[PDB]
Amino acid sequence: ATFEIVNRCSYTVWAAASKGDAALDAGGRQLNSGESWTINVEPGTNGGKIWARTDCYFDDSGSGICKTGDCGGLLRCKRFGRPPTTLAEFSLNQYGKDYIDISNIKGFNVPMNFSPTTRGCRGVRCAADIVGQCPAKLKAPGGGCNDACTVFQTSEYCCTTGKCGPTEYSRFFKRLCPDAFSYVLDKPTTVTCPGSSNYRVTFCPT
């Protein structure tokens, strides 16, 4: 499957793509404002994610740091990134279908649209100014808006027991972005696409 990753933000981002225990494609690449990077993701990829990272410094060997979404200091991500990270999430060729969503469960850093480029389903978007409107207690000094699990490490916010409810903090993410996951047990906003669809992830779509 092809994922065209497009940075419409006015600032550089470093895209990342991983399934948690491996890179997807090269795993990461710089995208200056307006650039596009097309990656190939293997059919059957389960639990893949794409995200932006902000304010990165890398050395000649690809080693460094980002203020958001850092994936163990690597340009080329093999693992998931440090919150806060707005997440484009996908499982492909899962009994004949693909499943896509956007999640704010690991916070928000960059607005995003995640849409198919092929027929048969709708995209999803979380483009509201979550960083600017972020509750004081969630603001990440490093940049972005942290999820409450990250900040507070409670069973209730992290849904550790599998019994959690919505919270003041989850309701903020949900209010600004109703079509993204706000906490682990949120009513799903997952979209079912045809198996082997192709996609475009756009940062700062509006």
CATH at 51: 2.60.110.10
Whole-angstrom distance, CA of residue 131 vs CA of residue 176: 11
The amino acid sitting at 4 is E
Whole-angstrom distance, CA of residue 131 vs CA of residue 108: 7
Resolution (in Å) of the shown entry?
Answer: 1.8
Count: domains in the chain = 1
Do residues 182 and 173 touch, judged by C-beta distance below 8 A? yes
Provide the domain limits for residue 143: 1-206
Main-chain dihedrals φ then ψ at residue 21, nearest 5 degrees: -120, 5
Do residues 70 and 81 touch, judged by C-beta distance below 8 A? yes
What separation in angstroms does the CA of 3 have from each of 15, 122, 185? 12, 15, 27
List alpha helices for the chain, DSSP H: 130-133, 148-152, 155-158, 168-176
Sign for the pseudo-dihedral over CA of 141, 160, 47, 79: positive
Whole-angstrom distance, CA of residue 138 vs CA of residue 150: 9
Strands 199-203, 2-7: pairing is parallel
Q: 57-67 burial, b for 16+ CB within 10 Å, e for fewer?
A: ebeeeeeeebb
